Design a protein that fits this description.
The structure is a homodimer.
Chain A (H helix, E strand, L loop, with lengths): L3 E5 L4 H6 L11 H6 L6 H11 L2 H4 L5 H29 L4 H6 L3 H9 L7 E2 L2 H14 L17 H27 L11 H18 L1 H5 L11 H11 L6 H23 L10 H16 L1 H4 L23 H30 L5 H17 L6 E2 L1 H9 L6 H16 L9 H11 L1 H4 L4 H8 L1 H15 L3 H21 L4 E5 L6 E3 L12 E5 L9 H11 L4 H15 L15 H4 L10 E5 L8 H16 L3 E5 L3 H9 L16 H17 L3
Subunit structure (chains A, B): Homodimer. Interacts (via STAS domain) with CALM; this interaction is calcium-dependent and the STAS domain interacts with only one lobe of CALM which is an elongated conformation. Interacts with MYH1.
GO cellular component, one term (chains A, B): lateral wall of outer hair cell
Membrane topology (chains A, B): Multi-pass membrane protein
């Protein structure tokens, strides 16, 4: 075996520096650093094509045997879920449901080629649909009359068309913003999305969706409220209007919701006995439309339905740029929220399955998809948590599952679009509610975060509160700001400890930690696990003057009191000898007689000018009362910062630095012994 | 002498822990921690009185011999400067100049008793006056007619009275806000005011004052613009209207400005030959009023003057609460700006003269002064940089200098208020401009900050730009946000280094730093001077995989390529043996054959859950390719955070920790030797 054995002289800063010679670096010119970027070698362009076109990468390496079955099952499962979710989200966007199915085909097909993640399900999203509906209602109210040859029997078709045009314009603007961010390499900001913030935001979004879905489930008309305090106003409005509910719609909604819960529980408890989960949502919608067609609930009980669905695709239409100045803020908010959600989902899925994704590529893909969808009459969409979870849980391995979902959506549109026109909205509302259980189950993190880290619990609660009461446009920004400020809070509240020397060794630990460390008499050691920046110097000084119990101010006051009671270019030395008479020292109150104070810098990352001034003031103040101060474990960054500042203007301060706490202690003891040598 | 000598066994985490026993702490109950707060001992109440009433402290200990002369000279010098500055600031507040002198008596007297700092000059301030004037104009335009018996010859007295009432109401609200903040111990936020931010804010405020003073100097009427892009609009407006200037006013202003510059330069170069500086501003105003009275410039050349000054004090008047809902934002902004400026000045003066101030006490004093001044017809004021500099430079030692200034201001008001009514505004504008040279000279910090620290230079430039173009209400907030974000920027860009062992010692330094350190073969050491929080884990992982040149992904790819080319409750062990045949190893590309990677945690302050997951993933990934990873120098905080998380669920991970880099290296070498013992 071997033992920790090392013998060396005391390494002060000048001694360490004189034994080392600075290495000569190789200057890399900017022109020379950019010249090789234009080699245009075939490998470089091939890599660029693969990065910009991920389809060319994962498609040639597609292993059919272990992927065809899983991709097929996952695609069927995600399509039979995207169709009702898309129809429900279309209603939430204040647009005809036919446009929701349109948004479920073009962006998915485009992302099957421009997408990097192979486990996320691109499609209609609840939050984006709610924001689009709110802005459409705000721009287009219910009191607009167009004399375009329409008679008095107005079916509000013009209002719906105007809302669709507004949605198309804002979608195009959001896509342009996303593409500009992607080409600007702005995707690096996704790292700021910590997991608790994302979970809290998703939970708050789930709460908003649940409280917005109440009106559809009950069937009672309620004004849509967008902005600050939207959730509370919406829920009190639906509570006040609950007296005029529809019995049939509520009953069928409760019945289908109970059936969905029973089927989901049965699938969960019979997972091993099935080769693939059965589509429960498809059975639910089939049952709902069959009952509605058989009993004619549209007029028999005045139960609202999804409405008519026109068939056939539409030719591309050029949008208009006359609405940018009205919804430019909302387009940016939609782009930010959608990009954040999709990048968070892609990152967590990549971590789960062991791969990587590129944020810039995702931004470019989202921008192109949104722009082309706007050209093809499709509103802005983003990633969906529940649908992606279903896709991954059913065996999703590549992006071909989304292509199958888009193909089957197109088939339904072209062939069986009329069959689903009689589906009541209550069934869709119940389907949305039951699929929301995954995000609602995330409330279990509160005890977990309470036990693990209270700071993360505070961040999660702040994010949830900000995204619940305040609008989602500013709630995410507020949550990000709070998360960033938590780092400042942590740096402003470090753990100050008094270190003691373990006997017969060189390990320094807290004096009040293990009962075996003995503090060296006459030496005080102070340690701070935080930087010395401007908003921390005062707290550090107070902690040093309090925890160590050595305050120069009170020492000077005691000296003055004892003196008054007993009476009845060159630089000066840093440490001034205590000119206190021995006779006066007889009336001096007893103390620890500390002669050396050691400050730990092993856990200091950087120091600013304010910190430099504070440290210089502390050193001078302690040297005035004749107490030596040495710096131990200073990193090269701290030394460089001190050199660039005016802290090292006096060459006599170079001897105050050391390399380790034990080295500083040995140097101080040697200095004391040498001083005692000439004493007598 | 002595040498660094220590012999000990390799201290792994279990070995260190088994040799130490946790100390039993003393639980301090909250009820027991608050019970002693109500002792009501005479010393405690005396200290409370001294803290709340600083006048009772420094007045009994007033040394007359060395303070009477200096305080007298400083008080005279600051009064003869506050009178013209107060008159000028009153005009900038869109209020009659008599109110400016009123603001120069009551708050100063009150602060002479409720103030802690003994070197700051409380009085009218340019920024606060400008904000008050802007809000008064915004609330009270020039198109308001009051049929209160006034004939067609309206002198706009009602408009001035309404503006005064608005100023009084906003001053009272700001004082209430300041008092509430003071009683809430909110003064601790003053630590966020770093020196570069304060200097940039003061410089931008000086620029705003200089560009606003142009209209008074020229005498041409110009609409006052408040809000965003106010400075640019004001300067282009005065440039367009410069064609209608007044020759006499501009000429006399230039003459008095030149005289002031000459006198200031003469005093600077004859400082040693004078016992006390002569009052130059008093001579300037006397000359200006004498010339104006002799030549009657009011009507001879249409030169505007300060106006009539009513005599006698006014009885207290109860304000109204009907304007809070209109200026509540502006009152908060005024309070924040004034408190920030005064606390910064008090802190820097305390540091210069070697004492301390309390932010909460300053907040309480400002709130009480503003509220009582509102009761006594006085607008909100704050500390002035130039006047405080003059007070300190003339020998200011206590607060009695301000009392003398208030007394002489009251004497002028009661006796010689009519004499100064003929003083032209050009003289006051020139006096303001010449006293602004101190803040304008602060532009020399740009090369200093460029050489010392580029980050502080960026902060200063950002603060200046934000407070120049954008409004001062939001410019300070933006500067604070940028300053806070600079810490995050520093933590997101650390300095990754590869460490090497100095021969015959235990000092590890950068391999490319001193040319003498030799890297130990087969061992990679990585060091990061930054935390491992959520917004830094990915960069840390990339740096570890790039700088060390040991990426498990490329290793696995090379192994697979070599294999394909040559072919033609218990837990698993963390490190998996490389099942690579020796025959296949013959086709394996050569490499450094690293068997151990050491991660430095001596400079790590904290790690979050995201960092814990990232570290666990890195450890597992490196153990998959059969590479050992050890953690060295982990602080108690990091160990506690890992324990609270799920990182230590497997007991086999406790042996991976160490106490020092050398200890980890010795342990790895011993493990390799032991493994080689059973090899053959």
């Amino acid at each position: 075996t071997q033992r920790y054995y090392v013998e060396r002289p005391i390494f002060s800063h000048p001694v360490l520096q004189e034994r080392l010679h600075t290495k000569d670096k190789v200057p890399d010119s900017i022109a020379d650093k950019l010249k090789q970027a234009f080699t245009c070698t075939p490998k470089k362009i091939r890599n660029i094509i693969y990065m910009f076109l991920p389809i060319t990468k994962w498609l040639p390496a597609y292993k059919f045997k272990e992927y065809v079955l899983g991709d097929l099952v996952s695609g069927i499962s995600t399509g039979v879920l995207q169709l009702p979710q898309g129809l429900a989200f279309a209603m939430l966007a204040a647009v005809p449901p036919i446009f929701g199915l349109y948004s479920s085909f073009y962006p998915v097909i485009m992302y099957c080629f421009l997408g990097t993640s192979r486990h996320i399900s691109i499609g209609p999203f609840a939050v984006i649909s709610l924001m689009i509906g709110g802005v459409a209602v705000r721009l287009v109210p219910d009191d607009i009359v167009i004399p375009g040859g329409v008679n008095a029997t107005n079916g509000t078709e013009a209002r719906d068309a105007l809302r669709v045009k507004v949605a198309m314009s804002v979608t195009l603007l959001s896509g342009i913003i996303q593409f500009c961010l992607g080409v600007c390499r702005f995707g690096f900001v996704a790292i700021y999305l910590t997991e608790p913030l994302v979970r809290g935001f998703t939970t708050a979004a789930a709460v908003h969706v649940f409280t917005s879905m109440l009106k559809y489930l009950f069937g009672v008309k309620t004004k849509r409220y967008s902005g600050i305090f939207s959730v509370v106003y919406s829920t009190v409005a639906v509570l006040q209007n609950v007296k005029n509910l529809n019995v049939c719609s509520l009953g069928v909604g409760l019945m289908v919701f109970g059936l969905l819960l029973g089927g989901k529980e049965f699938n969960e408890r019979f997972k091993e006995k099935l080769p693939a989960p059965i589509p429960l949502e498809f059975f639910a919608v089939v049952m709902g439309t069959g009952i509605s067609a058989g009993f004619n609930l549209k007029e028999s009980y005045n139960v609202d339905v999804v409405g008519t669905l026109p068939l056939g695709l539409l030719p591309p239409a050029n949008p208009d740029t006359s609405l940018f100045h009205l919804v430019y803020v909302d387009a940016i908010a939609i782009a930010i929220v959608g990009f954040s959600v999709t990048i968070s989902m892609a990152k967590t899925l990549a971590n789960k399955h062991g791969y990587q994704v590129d944020g810039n590529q995702e931004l470019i893909a989202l921008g192109l998809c949104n722009s082309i969808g706007s050209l093809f009459q499709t509103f802005s969409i983003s990633c969906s948590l529940s649908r992606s979870l279903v896709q991954e849980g059913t065996g999703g391995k590549t992006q071909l599952a989304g292509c199958l979902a888009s193909l089957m959506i197109l088939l339904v549109i072209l062939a069986t679009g009329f069959l689903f026109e009689s589906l009541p909205q209550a069934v869709l509302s119940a389907i949305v509610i039951v699929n929301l259980k995954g995000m609602f189950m995330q409330f279990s993190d509160l005890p977990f975060f309470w036990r693990t880290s209270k700071i993360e619990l505070t961040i999660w609660l702040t994010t949830f509160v900000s995204s619940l009461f305040l609008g989602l446009d500013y709630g995410l920004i507020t949550a990000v700001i709070i998360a960033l400020l938590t780092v400042i809070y942590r740096t402003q509240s470090p753990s100050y400890k008094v270190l003691g020397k373990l006997p017969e060794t060189d390990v320094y630990i807290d004096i009040d930690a293990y009962e075996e460390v003995k503090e060296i008499p006459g030496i005080k050691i102070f340690q701070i696990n935080a930087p010395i920046y401007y908003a921390n110097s005062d707290l550090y000084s107070n902690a040093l003057k309090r925890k160590t119990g050595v305050n120069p101010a009170v020492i000077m006051g005691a000296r003055r009191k004892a003196m008054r009671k007993y009476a009845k270019v060159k630089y000066p030395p840093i440490v001034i000898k205590s000119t206190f008479p021995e006779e006066m020292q007889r009336f001096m109150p007893p103390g620890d007689n500390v002669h050396t104070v050691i400050l730990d810098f092993t856990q200091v990352n950087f120091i600013d000018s304010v910190g430099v001034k504070t440290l210089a003031g502390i050193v001078k103040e302690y040297g005035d009362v004749g107490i030596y101060v040495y710096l131990a474990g200073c990193s090269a960054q701290v030394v460089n910062d001190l050199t660039r500042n005016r802290f090292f203007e006096n060459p006599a301060l170079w001897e105050l630095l050391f390399h380790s706490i034990h080295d500083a202690v040995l140097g101080s003891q040697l200095r004391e012994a040498l001083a005692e040598q000439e004493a007598s």
